[PDB]
Design a protein around this ligand. Structure first.
Ligand SMILES: CC(=O)N[C@@H]1[C@@H](O)[C@H](O[C@@H]2O[C@H](CO)[C@H](O)[C@H](O[C@]3(C(=O)O)C[C@H](O)[C@@H](NC(C)=O)[C@H]([C@H](O)[C@H](O)CO)O3)[C@H]2O)[C@@H](CO)O[C@H]1O
Ligand SMILES: CC(=O)N[C@@H]1[C@@H](O)[C@H](O[C@@H]2O[C@H](CO)[C@H](O)[C@H](O[C@]3(C(=O)O)C[C@H](O)[C@@H](NC(C)=O)[C@H]([C@H](O)[C@H](O)CO)O3)[C@H]2O)[C@@H](CO)O[C@H]1O
Ligand SMILES: CC(=O)N[C@@H]1[C@@H](O)[C@H](O[C@@H]2O[C@H](CO)[C@H](O)[C@H](O[C@]3(C(=O)O)C[C@H](O)[C@@H](NC(C)=O)[C@H]([C@H](O)[C@H](O)CO)O3)[C@H]2O)[C@@H](CO)O[C@H]1O
Ligand SMILES: *[C@@H]1O[C@H](CO)[C@@H](O[C@@H]2O[C@H](CO)[C@@H](O)[C@H](O)[C@H]2NC(C)=O)[C@H](O)[C@H]1NC(C)=O
Ligand SMILES: *[C@@H]1O[C@H](CO)[C@@H](O[C@@H]2O[C@H](CO)[C@@H](O)[C@H](O)[C@H]2NC(C)=O)[C@H](O)[C@H]1NC(C)=O
Ligand SMILES: *[C@@H]1O[C@H](CO)[C@@H](O[C@@H]2O[C@H](CO)[C@@H](O)[C@H](O)[C@H]2NC(C)=O)[C@H](O)[C@H]1NC(C)=O
Ligand SMILES: *[C@@H]1O[C@H](CO)[C@@H](O)[C@H](O)[C@H]1NC(C)=O
Ligand SMILES: *[C@@H]1O[C@H](CO)[C@@H](O)[C@H](O)[C@H]1NC(C)=O
Ligand SMILES: *[C@@H]1O[C@H](CO)[C@@H](O)[C@H](O)[C@H]1NC(C)=O
Ligand SMILES: *[C@@H]1O[C@H](CO)[C@@H](O)[C@H](O)[C@H]1NC(C)=O
Ligand SMILES: *[C@@H]1O[C@H](CO)[C@@H](O)[C@H](O)[C@H]1NC(C)=O
Ligand SMILES: *[C@@H]1O[C@H](CO)[C@@H](O)[C@H](O)[C@H]1NC(C)=O
Lengths: 164, 325, 325, 164, 325, 164
């Protein structure tokens, strides 16, 4: 990824997390467990459903060939017709294949950046109260229960409190 | 105590391509392109196509006696001609402007066969001896087209001038046909129509027509060295037709009331079977039942079809790159 | 003491769409697509179009007597035919190759009417009795076309052979017309042109023409059961034309010196008024005064127009996402 | 934004700043006030004027329909003509609509990244002499007058001096 | 002790454009577009084109006597006609359906000239006096086409009916030609073919033809006021042709066995020299020797060519932005 | 660059490094010298060769004009043919020029991001054992020989060891 995250410094993915695209794996005294960040997930989901539906929508026309026949002295207009039909066929084939390639590239880059930005979202909150390993895991200095983790998750982590 | 940031993965081995990278496995994708078809012809708008079977379009519309299965009224969503249909133009000749006639019939939905000129129209001539062994029915070795009539001088006298009128007072256009007989030599010309210069002429408000015989000896075709020039036209609502000839007239007899579609219209050359099923999209190659955007079966269709395209796959990644471990 | 980093915002509620997101308000954008037009026909290159008014192109160019408003010279940037113009071909017949004539005139800029064959050209015949109540002027019930002349045998004798020549020694091509009269029966043929087989023939360096009458009775049209086959051609600079007939000739009389544009050329079927204004882009739907790249008014235009397109809007974001608070 | 900045960690925008797209809101003993970073602004402006003019330029051709008429026996070539005109109409409509969508997406991403990079430009200069709140505001430890702020703005901020 | 992160640079001054930025120097790029050509005509598939030289296609195929350089068999990868070739149709007339004939020959690869109707075929007429000073060879002032023969009544008697047959029992289609002579007046008609109504007729399985003379006086062309209507057709394998005329027949004599390509086929109007070189791509403008994707030389080619395009450059950046210092 | 790196905070480039696109210039007691990061280089190289070959591949069709001639009464179908050929010519010209512009933009952005991400790769490894100047150079606090530098390069830099 161009944002360095997916198959980058975060070297792989959790088959464990089955309820979202991006999320969390906490680790504390009550236990661990996976849980997805529903917000940035639903954002990605809406944006990409949008991409797909816009692509399908723009592609909702058909050039239409015809069974018309041409005599022996109509070779020229016959050939004209063939060249036209093949022509249009060629440009629509090109448009489709190219658009698919390009869009896939940018879709992947999108996922990558969303991950990177979630990581940043966290690090920005926890600044001194933890240790950045550099593989996208954070090690606390203090204690974090469930109402603690939850506050990081729903973005309301009180840094003053745990800074001492 | 700690917390980690990461992403989804799964058992998926579905792959996509990018400008930078081919063969890239991802979590969730979608295929926009259909490649599966049912090799058959089904109904469109709950309306069934026309199977010409062992008849060509010419043989059907001219009323070839071995095409009597198709005789009378017909309605269709589309037309199916069979690759090696044997019955078309039995008596050797050319159908003038054949391709445009095929296009016109392609643009149709229904025909009503009716009688336009009873044999009584033609006065002082023989309307009952117009037959040839070039045009057999399944029940005799010498017949002729059901929609045309071969007028021949009465068994002695000469060929009088003959006249016909049909005033189209109805609301529908009429497709109709006639011909000019081109004999192989002077003596046949005389045996059939008598001597003297002969003409065939036809008038409407927006069309006229004149032609004389083109007498010469041609190669044998279905045992005939004569030819016929076939002609077709459309009498519009309000128009009326005058027929006038003093010889060599293959006179219109039956004709068709025609219903124009204003939509696309299709004539398929194919051997696929017509089955009693339904469909909302029908290619010459088969039926597509899809919700997908693209297809690579065929560019020729009737109904609502995906955009034809040459691609093998058009796979679009929606999920992220798959990295299980 | 502190310092902050941030971005612009404003009172804008203008929105755009993206592949990911619809309805997204932004600070500054631009609209590339014009949808506003002035429903009228204006001048192009300070040159005014031709209003045929109650004449069709046929009626104009053949010199229909009720089209005398248009008679003589004309210059145009483009042509406007009115949807229900009444005056075209008054005496029933067909203009051969009409569509190509319309295309040719479409490719023009100017015509100079001149006299090509004075009635004196035709010797030993009556050039003064060629009139019909099918073709009235606004001042008598029986006239004929201004550019054609109906030659009829002199009040007793037979129809002699008649001959005409025009050598185009000028630098401009000449558009001209003639016809063949098809009578309804033998006795009319004889009353007008006398007996015997008749022909009409015309020769140039790169064109020849022969035709005989096609005598038959047709449905009444403007009270006529006769027809006329109209024909048109272009005598190139350097070419010269020979006319030869022994009967049934509707002879050319007036003709046009034609100026070919080499540019596109337009013939608009429309009812919009022609006003004394100016324009650099003129659709069949109206005038566009824009600097924009796209338009959705019409695909048919003359002059320099934006690319026609089906879109409602083509709004392009230039500023950033608007987030006031 | 995929760079996280606009409507991200910088949650909103200043209607106050009316002289640029990106900029500053300082706060010191002489007073506050807004002021735009004219450099990266003029950069964005030139790049995007360029985008727009390139788009207009590439779109400077017109397919041209014709008033040509066809007889009753010219149904085939008539239909051929219609199919051609509609065909081309369809591909140009598609090209336009699609290009607009895509380009808007990337334009917005551009603005976002320019903001992010300005933020980085600053943080890189001031490293210890201030406190990163994480919402794109920086709180000084020392004193910063106007000739002080200005030096940050025109990129010549002397970090040695204020580090003690 | 320290370590730095950075990127490549070099002596390159090659530039590219982006949507955001024009004139941007980069380290490595590639040019996808060819603009260089060799102004000449070379061989294709090791097969050499046909240089018509001072003959037009008409003059070649009809057997104009000054085109005898081309007489006999020919094979080609493509055809080259010269802009101002002087020898085409020497005796004034029209070649019917010329454009379609040019297209058909364009779709070819080879012709074998053979004799289809020896002069003996035509019985009781003069096959040896058919010459005109309109059609000189390089060795006499009065000849005629090598592939046609001008039949004239025997030096006294009248014109009998004459008949010919050729049964195409071979595997190749045959291109062949004939004509109708249109005299300028009655007395010439009589001097050549005698009196009485005359016809020319031709029959095959899938084609028939009838025509009479169209006698009139035309402008002088190569000193002739007469015309000839030239006609061409293709006798398919299995078909057989009957010829029958009682006057005014320009009879087929030699004809061609034709080989259809099924590939594209090209006829180039150009003055470029044909040289003894090789090529895998050949435009009307010259040869392209490239591995590049695009080209801006010409849209007209034979062989495997890059996609024609109007661009000046299509430069694609592969390396990064160059910032040396 | 939108990732800020090329002609950004890294203000220029090393004509010295002639064996890769991205890399290193170390500086220690044995001497200095340039050396390229062959991994991310070969990655870029493969990705961009791929881009170029996909572009060439999708463009591997030709619309084909014809020498066909039209009589004086075939003006309409002649013009029809011309309009068709010019039409297709116009759309292929547009597709090519536009695609080139766009793709160049994104190629450059790619190079920029690859650089940025290499920088990050390093900084992530060396966290306390060096001083980030902010122009993409890192100044060690400890001593780094050649087997030391090499371990940073091949990504196996032991941070514990040198942290004291
Ligand atoms: C060796 C050779 O060429 N011999 C021909 C000889 O065959 C030909 O006679 C014609 O032969 C065909 C063979 O199938 C038919 O028998 C023709 O018969 C009919 C027909 O059935 O079509 C009889 C029919 O009743 C006639 N139709 C009417 C309406 O009267 C027609 C009609 O006369 C012809 O079709 C005119 O085209 O023919 C039979 O004529 C003779 C004829 O000249 O010529 C020999 O050379
Ligand atoms: C019930 C029926 O069908 N009766 C017709 C009868 O109408 C027809 O007479 C023709 O009637 C029309 C009606 O509008 C005109 O009166 C025709 O007159 C002229 C004409 O004006 O066109 C007179 C004119 O002077 C003649 N032109 C010249 C140059 O001499 C022409 C000319 O003779 C004809 O146009 C030839 O086409 O006609 C009038 O002839 C008669 C005619 O046969 O037939 C009845 O059955
Ligand atoms: C002032 C004027 O118009 N005078 C013409 C006079 O020229 C013309 O005579 C014809 O003149 C041309 C001039 O090049 C030839 O000399 C014609 O000669 C031939 C020919 O060579 O073509 C002789 C030839 O042998 C004849 N061909 C055959 C097969 O017999 C032909 C043939 O008769 C004509 O081509 C028929 O088209 O002509 C010569 O006829 C006369 C002719 O009427 O008319 C004067 O007015
Ligand atoms: C053209 O030539 C072939 C000769 O090869 C003719 O073929 C014959 O046709 C008849 C029936 O028409 C058959 O019964 C013969 O047995 C065939 N023989 C051969 C050898 O083919 C053909 O009919 C000829 N046609 C004309 C019009 O000349
Ligand atoms: C065809 O039929 C209609 C009959 O419906 C004819 O219409 C008449 O036309 C005349 C004038 O031509 C009118 O004055 C009559 O009042 C009409 N009557 C009706 C009932 O329509 C029509 O003219 C006929 N035409 C031909 C050529 O037969
Ligand atoms: C048409 O007009 C010109 C007159 O300008 C004729 O030109 C002459 O042609 C003959 C040969 O055909 C030359 O020898 C004369 O010297 C030419 N003179 C001039 C003044 O051009 C032309 O031939 C005429 N053609 C017809 C058929 O009328
Ligand atoms: C965050 O989580 C707690 C539950 O642990 C909930 O009660 C609180 O209201 C949440 N607040 C926000 C802003 O998400
Ligand atoms: C892509 O993967 C398929 C197997 O899934 C393989 O057969 C093919 O060769 C690969 N192509 C490329 C270009 O890597
Ligand atoms: C976009 O906004 C308009 C109002 O500005 C609204 O009516 C429309 O439904 C919206 N469409 C979508 C797809 O959000
Ligand atoms: C920065 O700002 C001061 C004014 O406060 C000005 O005099 C100085 O020259 C500027 N230098 C640069 C490099 O912008
Ligand atoms: C681009 O550079 C060329 C010189 O290499 C210059 O002549 C031209 O004017 C420049 N164009 C633009 C738009 O900067
Ligand atoms: C790193 O470099 C040393 C040589 O300095 C080499 O022996 C070692 O195996 C390398 N290991 C990796 C993982 O690159």
């Amino acid at each position: 990824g161009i944002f360095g995250a997916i198959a980058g410094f975060i070297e792989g993915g959790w088959t464990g997390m089955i309820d979202g695209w991006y999320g969390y794996h906490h680790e504390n005294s009550q236990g661990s467990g996976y849980a997805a960040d529903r917000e940035s997930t639903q954002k990605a989901i809406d944006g990409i459903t949008n991409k797909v539906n816009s692509i399908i929508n723009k592609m909702n026309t058909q050039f239409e060939a015809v069974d018309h026949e041409f005599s022996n002295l109509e070779r020229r207009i016959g050939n004209l017709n063939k060249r036209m039909e093949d022509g249009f066929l060629d440009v629509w084939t090109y448009n489709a294949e190219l658009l698919v390639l390009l869009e896939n590239e940018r879709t992947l880059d999108l996922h990558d950046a969303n991950v990177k930005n979630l990581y940043e979202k966290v690090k920005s909150q926890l600044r001194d109260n933890a240790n950045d390993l550099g593989n996208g895991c954070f090690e606390f200095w203090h204690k974090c229960d469930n109402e603690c983790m939850e506050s990081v998750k729903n973005g309301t982590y009180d840094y003053p409190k745990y800074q001492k | 105590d700690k917390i980690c940031i990461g992403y989804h993965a799964n058992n998926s081995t579905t792959q996509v391509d990018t400008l930078l990278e081919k063969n890239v496995t991802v979590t969730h994708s979608v295929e926009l392109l259909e490649n599966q078809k049912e090799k058959r012809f089904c109904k469109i708008m709950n309306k069934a196509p026309l199977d010409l079977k062992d008849c060509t379009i010419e043989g059907w519309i001219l009323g070839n006696p071995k095409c009597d299965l198709l005789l009378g009224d017909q309605s269709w969503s589309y037309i199916v001609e069979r690759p090696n249909a044997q019955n078309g133009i039995c008596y050797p000749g050319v159908l003038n402007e054949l391709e445009e006639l095929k296009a016109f019939i392609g643009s149709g939905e229904r025909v009503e066969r009716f009688e336009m000129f009873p044999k009584s129209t033609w006065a002082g001539v023989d309307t009952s001896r117009g037959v040839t062994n070039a045009c057999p029915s399944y029940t005799l070795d010498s017949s002729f087209y059901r929609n045309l009539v071969w007028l021949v001088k009465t068994d002695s006298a000469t060929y009088p001038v003959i006249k016909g009128t049909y005033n189209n007072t109805g609301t529908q256009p009429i497709l109709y046909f006639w011909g000019v007989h081109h004999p192989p030599d002077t003596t046949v010309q005389d045996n059939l129509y008598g001597s003297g210069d002969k003409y065939v002429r036809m008038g409407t408000e927006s069309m006229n027509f004149a032609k004389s015989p083109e007498i010469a000896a041609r190669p044998a075709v279905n045992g005939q060295r004569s030819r016929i020039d076939y002609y077709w036209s459309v009498l519009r609502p309000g128009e009326t037709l005058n027929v006038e000839s003093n010889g060599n007239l293959i006179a219109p007899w039956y004709a068709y009331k025609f219903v124009s579609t204003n939509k696309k219209g299709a004539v398929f050359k194919s051997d696929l079977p017509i089955e009693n099923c339904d469909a909302t999209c029908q290619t010459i190659a088969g039926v597509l039942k899809t919700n997908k955007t693209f297809q690579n079966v065929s560019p020729l269709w009737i109904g609502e079809c995906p955009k034809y395209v040459k691609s093998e796959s058009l796979r679009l990644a929606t999920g992220l790159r798959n990295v299980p471990q």
